[PDB]
Write a structure and sequence with these properties.
CATH class of the largest domain in chain B: Alpha Beta
Number of strands of chain A: 5
Shape of chain B: globular
Largest sheet of chain B: 9 strands, mixed
Helix content of chain B: 25-40%
CATH superfamily of the largest domain in chain B: Alanine racemase
Strand content of chain A: 25-35%
CATH topology of chain A: Aminopeptidase
Subunit structure (chain B): Monomer. Interacts with OAZ1 and OAZ3; this interaction disrupts the interaction between the antizyme and ODC1.
Radius of gyration of chain A: 13 Å
Helix content of chain A: 25-40%
CATH architecture of the largest domain in chain B: Alpha-Beta Barrel
Structural class of chain B: alpha/beta
Number of helices of chain A: 2
Largest interface: A-B, 34 and 33 residues
Oligomer: heterodimer
Number of strands of chain B: 17
Largest sheet of chain A: 5 strands, mixed
Protein name (chain B): Antizyme inhibitor 1
Radius of gyration of chain B: 23 Å
Subcellular location (chain B): Nucleus
Order of helices and strands of chain A: EEHEHEE
Family (chain B): Belongs to the Orn/Lys/Arg decarboxylase class-II family. ODC antizyme inhibitor subfamily.
GO molecular function (chain B): ornithine decarboxylase activator activity; ornithine decarboxylase activity
Distance between the termini of chain A: 34 Å
Distance between the termini of chain B: 11 Å
Chain lengths: ~90, ~400
């Protein structure tokens, strides 16, 4: 099934905004090819996750990208947009 | 890189209290204390329970140079999750035959690096990663990652069949099966299911003509004795009959939280206080060594209990560590003790936490010392870095 995800690229650093609710199946492959495309053509030096604070699956996605290799970034970072109603994780390349 | 001696007359209490004493006037920063003796004791516990399984420590739990050094000294393998990790491990002087990468989502640069460094054993849980594996490293050794019946990860039996078929077409060698059984799970029968799935591969790959010689069982261990005891009480009767010694079986495990979680203790300082029930602010929080709260009890240093909430120095709404606790009236400048601070509490110093990292203090007992000395470990060349006193 075709899946639409909102993702925005700026300043050579990619930002992914996840919508509320659970994920559809085959999403593993989805973020997989998301990273493949993040490296091959657009050549990102850093990938980033952002999602709304008030949800019952905050810990779920946090631990998800935790296992995926993402690390927590404190709001207020120069590369992070000033928005205190969002949680942020980060994965850096070499 | 310094660990102090401890006799029966001395305890952790006095090194904690002394570090408190000296930090009170100086930097005023938090402090970490790690018991390597309990890691060694857990290695002896492992060898006691099951010795025919080689543990491969997940670095993401603790990536401090000291722990990695003593673990490499113990002969324990390494489970990798990043290329910087692999860089540090390879820089230490570890053999590539005892290195495994674990990240559920691999990248092209990472696998090119893995290919360049000579590490062939790696896991996989989808067709895309298999495709890039075949695309860049034709001589890679593949471990199939399966799912468990406990948001999602792993590969279904049918898709595992498709995976081994494609792998056969892509001329890449599959050697074993990979999975993870969480520490929290107590449902024994579950393991059977997992193992049954592995048996499936043992058949299917066996039918396709590939050689199997390794089984990875994961890293779901709490650290306590009874947990591992139940683990063997379930795994041992079934394992020896399906893969006995001499069948060419090399079983592998990947302990992470197991060795270090309850092995570390954190000493923290108070910087703020507010009366509404009370709310108290520390000089550290979730944005640092307290990520593990997302997935354990404080004690008072000094000699009337009130309910209170814990906040960090970031003061933002997300910096809640404990929802409700009971403590006597305190003021700014007091100390707090946190046990079980080993699981995912060590991160690298950067702008993420204002270039601030807690000090590194290590503890060792005489008993564990003679326990390592008689094992013939202290005399080999790989530990020229050690400094103990």
């Amino acid at each position: 099934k075709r899946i639409n995800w909102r993702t925005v690229l700026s300043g050579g650093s990619l930002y992914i905004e996840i919508p509320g609710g659970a994920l559809p199946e085959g999403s593993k492959d989805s973020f997989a090819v998301l990273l493949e495309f993040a490296e091959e053509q657009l050549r990102a030096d850093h990938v980033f996750i952002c999602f709304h604070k008030n949800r019952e699956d905050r810990a779920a996605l946090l631990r998800t990208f935790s296992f995926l290799g993402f690390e927590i970034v404190r709001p207020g970072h120069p590369l992070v947009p000033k928005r205190p109603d969002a949680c942020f994780m980060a994965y850096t390349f070499e | 890189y310094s660990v102090g001696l401890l006799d029966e007359g001395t305890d952790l209490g006095n090194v904690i209290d002394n570090y408190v004493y000296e930090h009170t006037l100086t930097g005023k920063n938090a402090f970490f204390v790690g018991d390597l003796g309990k890691i060694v004791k857990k290695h002896s516990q492992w060898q006691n329970v099951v010795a025919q399984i080689k543990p491969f420590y997940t670095v993401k739990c603790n990536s401090a140079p000291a722990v990695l050094e003593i673990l490499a000294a113990l002969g324990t393998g390494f489970a990798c999750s990043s290329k910087n990790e692999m860089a540090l491990v390879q820089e230490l002087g570890v053999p590539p035959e005892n290195i495994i990468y674990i990240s559920p989502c691999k990248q092209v640069s990472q696998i090119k690096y893995a290919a360049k460094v000579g590490v062939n054993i790696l896991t996989c849980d989808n067709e895309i990663e298999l495709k890039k594996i075949a695309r860049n490293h034709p001589n890679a050794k593949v471990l199939l990652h399966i799912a468990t019946e406990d948001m999602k990860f792993g590969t279904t039996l049918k898709n595992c069949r498709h995976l081994l078929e494609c792998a056969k077409e892509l001329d890449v060698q599959i050697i074993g099966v990979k999975f993870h059984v969480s520490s929290a799970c107590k449902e024994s029968q579950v393991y059977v299911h997992a193992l049954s799935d592995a048996r499936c591969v043992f058949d299917m790959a066996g039918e396709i003509g590939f050689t199997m010689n390794m089984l990875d069982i994961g890293g779901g261990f709490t650290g306590t004795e009874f947990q591992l005891e139940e683990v063997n009480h379930v795994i041992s009767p079934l394992l020896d009959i399906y893969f006995p010694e001499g069948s060419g079986v090399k079983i592998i495990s990947e302990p992470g939280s197991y060795y270090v979680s309850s092995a570390f203790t954190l000493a923290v300082n108070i910087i703020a206080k507010k009366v509404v029930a009370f709310m108290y602010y520390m000089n550290d929080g979730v944005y640092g060594s307290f990520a593990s709260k997302l997935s354990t009890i404080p004690e008072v240093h000094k000699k009337p209990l009130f309910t209170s909430s814990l906040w960090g120095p970031s003061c933002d709404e997300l910096d809640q560590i404990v929802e409700s606790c009971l403590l006597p009236e305190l003021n700014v400048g007091d100390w707090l003790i946190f046990d079980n601070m080993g699981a995912d509490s060590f991160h690298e110093p950067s702008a993420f936490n204002d270039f601030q990292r807690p000090a590194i203090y290590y503890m060792m007992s005489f008993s564990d010392w003679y326990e390592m000395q008689d094992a013939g470990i202290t005399s080999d060349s790989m530990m020229k870095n050690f400094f103990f006193v």
